[PDB]
Ligand binder design. Structure first.
Ligand SMILES: OC[C@H]1O[C@H](O)[C@H](O)[C@@H](O)[C@H]1O
Length: 584
């Protein structure tokens, strides 16, 4: 073409801000055309203006997607489908993409060199229900709660439903928040909610007749929810060189950003957050803010704001298949085991694999290489639950599924990580999960009142089936303020290194190695700073621990440092309230 970049200002093509019309069928039809014309090396930009674009289900594409760490409800109702479309940039100018009903806002499928920039994603009617405690009669167990202004509910058979366009969902749990600070209420975590046995006092004032909780003082704001997570805000599958710059996801029925089987991801200014100090909402995403399942290359996530999520800010991990059958010396059948991670590819020819003894979480040193890999399917349409993997090298007969439980990590689909200069706060569960053997830098982050623990290095081939023996990770120059006001799975200390190990007494081999924790600041009211299970090599140096009394100490673990099957400890130049603490 006669142009280096072909720029499509959307308003020039019949797609205007603040029209209040359904943008879905228009942008869909338009992209389809721009695609059919642009050859491959051709570069494209799609440009939104200031103001608001609404997207509804009607006229949306219906894609069958399998999404890591999410409910496998199909089809998905997809707002914007970037599919097999390269060198494309979606850009806005303080733009507000507003979605309605149950939708997957943005899907990036099998696309390279995609950039998303200066653009916000939100739903008008979040499936999460915000309410405010009006009166709590602790004796009778009567709570009156006020629905927030934007909430449309129905009562049917004394049951509280939350509604939006084409959906109706009864909340079963919640997260309580301090009024004002927007912290999560001390020792709350997941709590039951009084959505059964209800009746209407007056519009937007609901009486719960059998709700007993002394913690829900007048003023407390509660995010009532279910466990459903069918679609993330931005889904990315099989991307190469993907970019997000100044992109905020304010809410989605699932994770903010879920990227899988993607090589190289760059994020500057990514937020999953509120619209500022004046946002009436206390909550953001129904699940994790950002999530990276089975990625590779380099992941940069910097200068982000994550707040009020119903889960972690970042989670970086792979998937252990479980071997169900050994056909011969070279060939096994292996299966996806969790309900929320199946239906997508796991590896390719030439991938490096290693095997794990699930019961004691011990690696075999003998690595292998995939020679062949084919999903096993009765009908073509069926989803990928089960593979037949062939290795180049023969397997030592000790690797037989009828002898013990054996898992497979794909060491090729593992990304390197830079997670710097972010702010995480006021969110459910942990702050950040890292599970990658590749080099990882976690630096100059602020963990301001995470509900659970700040950082979690896990690994589990029994429950979650999420890989991550760590080998190389520096957690430096971070600030951790009053982490762990509430318990969740694995929250044993501000930094918890907690692999899921069924049989620890019999473990000979250390699961994690090469962990350096240098020059951090821990502002805490409690005791537990570091918990470490099954580590060979653990540096803890130059760290400052400052005590405060913003809350009562309470954690069962009353030890600053708690090690279990840990060798290789280097511990120097640490302080507590400006006084040294040495091992010797
Ligand atoms: O501990 C693993 C767990 O971490 C978070 O809670 C995610 O929401 C889950 O999908 C899973 O990744």
């Amino acid at each position: 073409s006669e142009f280096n970049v072909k720029i499509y200002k959307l308003s020039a093509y019949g797609i205007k801000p603040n029209s209040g019309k359904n943008t879905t069928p228009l942008l869909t039809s338009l992209l389809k055309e721009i695609k059919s014309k642009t050859s491959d090396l051709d570069k494209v930009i799609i440009q939104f203006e200031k103001g608001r674009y609404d997207f509804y289900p009607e006229g949306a594409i219906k894609r069958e997607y399998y999404i890591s760490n999410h409910d496998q409800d199909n089809p998905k109702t997809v707002g914007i489908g970037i599919e097999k479309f390269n060198n494309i940039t979606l850009i806005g100018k303080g733009t507000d993409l507003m979605f309605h009903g149950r939708m997957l806002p943005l899907a990036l499928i099998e696309s390279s060199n995609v950039k998303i920039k200066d653009l916000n994603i939100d739903f008008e009617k979040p499936q999460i229900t915000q309410v405010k405690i009006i009166s709590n009669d602790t004796t009778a167990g009567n709570i009156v709660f006020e629905t927030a202004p934007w909430v449309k509910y129905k009562l049917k058979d004394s049951t509280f439903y939350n509604t939006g366009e084409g959906w109706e969902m009864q909340p079963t749990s919640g997260i309580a928040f301090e009024n004002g600070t927007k912290h999560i209420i001390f020792n709350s975590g997941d709590i039951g909610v009084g959505t059964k046995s209800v009746s209407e006092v007056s519009p937007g004032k609901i009486m719960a007749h059998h709700w007993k909780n002394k913690k829900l003082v007048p003023g407390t704001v509660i995010a009532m929810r279910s466990w459903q997570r069918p679609a993330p805000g931005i889904f990315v599958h099989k991307g190469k060189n993907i970019s997000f710059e100044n992109v905020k996801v304010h809410y989605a029925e699932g994770m903010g950003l879920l990227a899988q089987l993607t090589e190289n991801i760059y994020m500057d200014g990514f937020g999953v957050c509120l619209r500022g100090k004046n946002d009436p909402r206390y909550f953001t995403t129904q699940a994790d803010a950002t999530h990276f399942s089975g990625c590779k290359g380099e992941i940069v996530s910097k200068n982000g704001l994550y707040e009020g999520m119903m889960d972690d800010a970042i989670n970086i991990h792979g998937t252990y298949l479980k071997i169900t059958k050994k056909l011969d010396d070279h060939t096994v059948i292996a299966n996806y085991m969790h309900e929320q991670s199946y239906g997508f590819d796991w590896g390719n020819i030439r991938d490096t694999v290693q095997f794990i003894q699930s019961k004691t979480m011990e690696l075999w040193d003998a690595k292998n290489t995939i020679a062949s890999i084919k999903p096993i399917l009765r009908n073509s349409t069926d989803p990928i639950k089960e593979f037949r993997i062939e290795f180049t090298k023969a397997l030592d007969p000790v690797i037989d599924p009828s002898k013990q439980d054996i898992g497979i990590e794909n060491l090729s689909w593992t990304p390197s990580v830079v997670f710097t200069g972010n702010t995480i706060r006021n969110n459910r569960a942990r702050g950040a999960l890292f599970s990658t053997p590749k080099p990882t830098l976690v630096a100059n982050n602020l963990f301001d009142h995470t509900s659970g623990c700040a950082i979690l290095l896990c690994g589990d081939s029994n429950g979650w089936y999420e890989t991550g023996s760590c080998r190389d990770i520096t957690i430096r120059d971070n600030k951790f303020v009053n982490a762990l006001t509430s318990m969740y799975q694995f929250t044993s200390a501000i930094i918890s290194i907690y692999p899921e190990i069924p049989d620890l007494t019999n473990q000979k081999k250390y699961f994690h190695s090469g962990i350096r924790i240098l020059n951090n600041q821990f502002d805490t009211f409690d005791q537990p700073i570091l918990y470490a299970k099954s580590v060979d090599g653990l540096v803890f140096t130059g760290n400052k621990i400052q005590t405060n009394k913003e809350y009562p100490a309470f954690h069962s673990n009353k030890k600053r440092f708690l090690f279990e099957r840990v060798i290789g400890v280097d511990f120097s130049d640490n302080k507590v309230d400006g006084k040294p603490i040495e091992m010797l």
